[PDB]
Amino acid sequence: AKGKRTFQPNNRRRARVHGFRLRMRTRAGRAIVANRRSKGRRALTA
């Protein structure tokens, strides 16, 4: 009777895996942020 779906929300973990600071510390993340800014997203990152 297992019915556990894949998405389990957690605000802190979502921040520490997808957040602004983690996107910035690396190089591909800064690329992603610049790309999203150029596209026009109102939300660059989690």
Added chain:
Amino acid sequence: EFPSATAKARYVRVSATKARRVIDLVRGKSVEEALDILRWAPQAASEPVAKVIASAAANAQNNEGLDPSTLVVATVYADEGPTAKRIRPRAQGRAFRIRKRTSHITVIVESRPP
């Protein structure tokens, strides 16, 4: 020809084919007979159509100024109206469509001789 009065009810939240099923009961009858038939008929679509008939009678009361008792429901019909579309979710991720249908009931009554 005979003097006539009209009444229209649009965007009534009743399927056209479910309005016609009680419209077919009262076509070509005296207004009072039609109102009685609708008042004792056990289908909900009677509530709109009855009102429409009564409305038409009042017009002949108040705009043609003609005799209440000579009125006959000469023409009555139900046109389709706009349909809203909704979704009912079904088994295994299917999503089926639902139509919320409407109607326009039109009545013309005439003041025929006795």
Added chain:
Amino acid sequence: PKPTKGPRLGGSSSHQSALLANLATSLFEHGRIKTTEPKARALRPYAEKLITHAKKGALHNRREVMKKIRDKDVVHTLFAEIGPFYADRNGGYTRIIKVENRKGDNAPMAVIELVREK
């Protein structure tokens, strides 16, 4: 009296029994109730046999009706008013009259009352 022939009235056998008991309690309390037509047709004989118990005055009959009804104010009013009221009527204490259909499910409605002529 004779059982229900088809499926029992309240959805099961035990619900029909309690349903009848509540309907009879309300009928004896108010003297007139409005319910659905099949419920009224089932309540007529069941209520009339309780009235027959109340017509004949013994502790044994009072015990039978308390067995079936479970409301002591209604038992008192049975044996104090309704039993004596029908001392000269031989059966047929009730009256079912059909009334206008319901609106939500278009259920055929009816009214049961107690006869007040003799």
Added chain:
Amino acid sequence: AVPKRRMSRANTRSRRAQWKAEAPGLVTVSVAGQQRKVPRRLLKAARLGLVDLD
């Protein structure tokens, strides 16, 4: 099973025809000195004032 062919207008209208209603048979009663029409089923209940003649 599933319909093999789309069904024709004659055959559609043939059994859409059976989905009709019948008008109740009315009789006359006198309440408050004025005449009204009610089903013969509700005749008594109108005669002792338990149906609401609007």
Added chain:
RNA sequence: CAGACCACGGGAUUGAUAGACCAGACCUGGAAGCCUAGUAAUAGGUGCAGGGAACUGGCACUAACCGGCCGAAAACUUAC
């Protein structure tokens, strides 16, 4: 006791069609209250008791109504 609905069959006050009521057949098995015996659980009496649906017969007490809708005819020819 006819039946998915419909149909079918019976009755509808000039009436026993169904319910109630009274009685019977039947089923269970000896009600409650009282009295009594025994410390008691319990047993005996009152007493084939009490309860009770379908079956039968009585009985208009209750409903079958101060009711609506349908529904009846060209003629012609020859023989007679």
Added chain:
RNA sequence: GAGUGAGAAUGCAGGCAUGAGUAGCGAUUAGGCAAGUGAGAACCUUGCCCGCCGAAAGACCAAGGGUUCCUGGGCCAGGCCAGUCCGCCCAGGGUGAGUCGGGACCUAAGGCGAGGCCGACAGGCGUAGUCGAUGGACAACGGGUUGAUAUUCCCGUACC
């Protein structure tokens, strides 16, 4: 001079039929009556019954949600029916801490990591450090109050 001609590409979009007024209307609890409200009530309000849960189908939280909470109003859409009702729509209101749960205290796994070493470059690891609770340290209890908060407000008595 051509974005120049459609009936087929299990073609693309939109609108609409057929099935069809058909299946279904989402558990294993079950509702009834009297009264009220209202244009309208099986479903709303009140009473009296009946029933179901009761190591829960009760009480309180974390995570997650985000105003759904309270009051007044509403009834077009939503509610698998109707709705006067609603977790729905609208407006206003509502969350009060020295002691509760965190930070200003401490660290674990781990993360990042001054200088650093390694690596053609991009980078990889990492020292000192500095973060990081799911743990350690650290002082408040009973009663009352609002339509909506309560070891928070108030009352009584405390502690750091």
Added chain:
RNA sequence: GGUGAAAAGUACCCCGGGAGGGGAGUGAAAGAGUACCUGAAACCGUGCGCUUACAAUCCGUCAGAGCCCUCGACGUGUCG
């Protein structure tokens, strides 16, 4: 995406709980009513005309009785 030139966006009255309409007004127009230029087809009705319930129909085509409408003529109903 498109009311109209301009909101002049339907005062007031009537039926309806409202929604919707009917008069009255605005307008060149309301076959422009804030569901709004034009408003095709699919699809859905209503009214009338002819036909259809002994009949095996790729649903047409060719021949064709009867009925209905219309245009001429003579006339006054029958040809063309």
